[PDB]
Design a protein around this ligand. Structure first.
Ligand SMILES: CC(=O)N[C@H]1[C@H]([C@H](O)[C@H](O)CO)O[C@](O)(C(=O)O)C[C@@H]1O
Length: 308
């Protein structure tokens, strides 16, 4: 095609993220009258999300996904998006990004500092905890060897509940679980399904600890080279895809629980009050480390009403 573009991602071909990227690619090809063709590179072929963000910045990759929280690597106050139990629901996540002074500033900085344009935001599930032994209460977390991604907020979740965190890349998790090199991991239900972690974990606990969004990002180097009519095609297709992406996750959360039960997984519902209590010193550490910028972001987010 005139524009042979590439979209990289961490998740595999069975995932909701891939299905939504496929819809995006199909709509762009149709509505651009074949001028743009997007190829998909799943399963971390091009690196992890940190590496792929760098590739958008330098113009060697055209599209990728990221969470709003991942920008904590550049702007420490953006950790607020993944402080455990702070963001209640997806309504709050949307308004935090688009309808606060903090969020609007972050969108501007992505463009000016990092060379990436935000096209759309979707819901990517609420993270839960799987393990090789039952989690009936906070006591069962003590000493659990919990895999986490290479992200400070996930590491903190594990440390503050008393687990022993082990950071590793997403591609390595299935084998670590299979060999019991680690005792468990944490991810939304959809990822547990897509990666088949239910084959190698007997238990699922509804810890509801971190809510993930998903941003459709384009490299400025690519976006700038498109004529404005094709920029519009891309933007409109990203907003349509994000609607579909969100629907996939919202529908799955309804009934994936019964799918896992049919596969032999036992589901627990630990009392979350001690889990939430255990995070209080972490919120304090966050404010100490990020100062008034972090305090302000927290206050803007805590002000948002979660009811539509
Ligand atoms: C956009 C993206 O790549 N998301 C990935 C996230 C983030 O890297 C992490 O939450 C830190 O932001 O990690 C996973 O959930 C994980 O490794 O378990 C896989 C998921 O595909």
């Amino acid at each position: 095609a005139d524009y042979d573009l590439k979209f990289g991602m961490n998740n595999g071909t069975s995932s909701n993220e891939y299905k939504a990227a496929e819809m995006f690619a199909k709509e762009v090809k149709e509505k651009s009258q074949g001028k743009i063709e997007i190829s998909l590179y799943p399963s971390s072929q091009l690196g992890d999300d940190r590496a792929m963000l760098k590739q958008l910045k330098d113009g060697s990759l055209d599209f990728t996904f990221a969470e709003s929280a991942r920008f904590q690597l550049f702007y420490p106050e953006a950790a607020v998006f993944a402080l455990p139990y702070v963001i209640s629901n997806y309504n709050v996540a949307q308004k935090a990004l688009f309808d606060t002074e903090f969020g609007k500033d972050l969108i501007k900085k992505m463009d000016k500092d990092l060379g990436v344009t935000l096209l759309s935001q979707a819901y990517n599930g609420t993270r839960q905890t799987t393990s090789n032994r039952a989690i009936n209460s906070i006591a069962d977390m003590k000493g659990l060897k919990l895999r986490v991604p290479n992200a400070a907020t996930n590491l903190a979740y594990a440390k503050y509940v008393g687990a022993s965190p082990t950071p590793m890349a997403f591609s390595e998790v299935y084998l670590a679980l299979q060999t019991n090199a680690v005792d468990g991991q944490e991810n939304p239900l959809a990822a547990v399904q897509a990666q088949k972690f239910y084959e190698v974990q007997k238990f699922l606990a509804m810890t509801n600890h971190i809510l993930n969004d998903q941003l459709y990002l384009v490299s400025n180097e690519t976006y700038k080279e498109l004529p404005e009519d094709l920029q519009k095609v891309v933007k409109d297709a990203a907003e349509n895809a994000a609607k579909y992406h969100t629907k996939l996750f919202v529908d799955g959360e309804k009934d994936l629980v019964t799918f896992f039960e049919k596969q032999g997984v036992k589901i627990t519902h630990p009392d979350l009050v001690p889990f939430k209590e255990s995070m209080k010193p972490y919120y304090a550490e966050f404010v100490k480390q990020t100062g008034q910028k972090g305090e302000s972001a927290l206050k803007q987010i805590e002000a948002i009403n979660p009811h539509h």
